[PDB]
């Protein structure tokens, strides 16, 4: 019934500009107050800007005053947020939210949109760097050894990793990538194999990063 649709978000460099759009439907729009609430990854929720039902009252959070400009078009069922001089610290998912009615102020947000992602970083498309991970029988179980290869300092997401041209599927564990302070992602991919196969079977990991048309193969031998 009640619907909210965010749009316009994406990637932009620090200092750039972005206009977020939220289209609503299903109810009498020009009767309600609207709000923007954002959320950085792994952080809490932060209110950004408020706007009255007829644009007569607008307030901004003291963190973002002068840099963000809220607007509404009651005829188009639309809500806009112009964001200037964007910083990397603003990197967050931005949510469209409606202010419900209460008896006496301090109201709640009854319905929320699906949110749009705005990522700001000093970042450029880069290819991955691959390094092998030499094995040994250390912490694992009887005859099991973990070998792999490391995909470091790549951007952006995603990176696809297979093993031996996809012929090997049993025992594969690919780990989620960390977002380093440099602004680059880095992931690993390991496979558990028998101790006897170290001197016999050849193991090559196949990394493919289609955003850069980069395909890299790294042979991993023990030390």
């Amino acid at each position: 019934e009640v619907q909210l649709v965010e749009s316009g978000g994406g990637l932009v460099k620090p200092g750039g500009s972005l206009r977020l759009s939220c289209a609503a439907s299903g109810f009498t729009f020009s009767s309600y107050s609207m709000n923007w609430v954002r959320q950085a990854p792994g952080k809490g929720l932060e209110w950004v800007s408020s706007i009255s039902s007829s644009s007569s009252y607008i307030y901004y959070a003291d963190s973002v005053k002068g840099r963000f400009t809220i607007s509404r078009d009651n005829a188009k069922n639309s809500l806009y947020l112009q964001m200037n001089s964007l910083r990397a610290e603003d990197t967050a998912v931005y949510y469209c939210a409606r202010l419900g009615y209460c008896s006496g102020g301090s109201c709640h947000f009854d319905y929320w949109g699906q949110g749009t992602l705005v990522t700001v970083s000093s970042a450029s498309t880069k290819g991955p760097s691959v390094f092998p991970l030499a094995p040994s029988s250390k912490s694992t179980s009887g005859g099991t050894a973990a070998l792999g290869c490391l995909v470091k300092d790549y951007f952006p997401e995603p990176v696809t990793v297979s093993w031996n041209s996809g012929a090997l599927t049993s025992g594969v564990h690919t780990f989620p990538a960390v977002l380093q302070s440099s602004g680059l992602y880095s992931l690993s991919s390991v496979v558990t194999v028998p101790s006897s196969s170290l001197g016999t079977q050849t193991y090559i990991c196949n990394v493919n990063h289609k955003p850069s048309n980069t395909k890299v193969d790294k042979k991993v031998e023990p030390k």
């Binding site: 609430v37 092998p132 030499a134 250390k138």
Partner: peptide
């Protein structure tokens, strides 16, 4: 300004406590 709480992640214990499995790799010779 509208304030929010610091957040509560509720974790429903549906399976017994599991020990973390640790595998450590050195820097590659490469």
């Amino acid at each position: 300004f509208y304030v929010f709480g610091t957040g509560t992640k509720v974790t429903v214990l549906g399976q017994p406590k599991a020990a973390p499995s640790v595998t450590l790799f050195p820097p590659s010779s490469e």
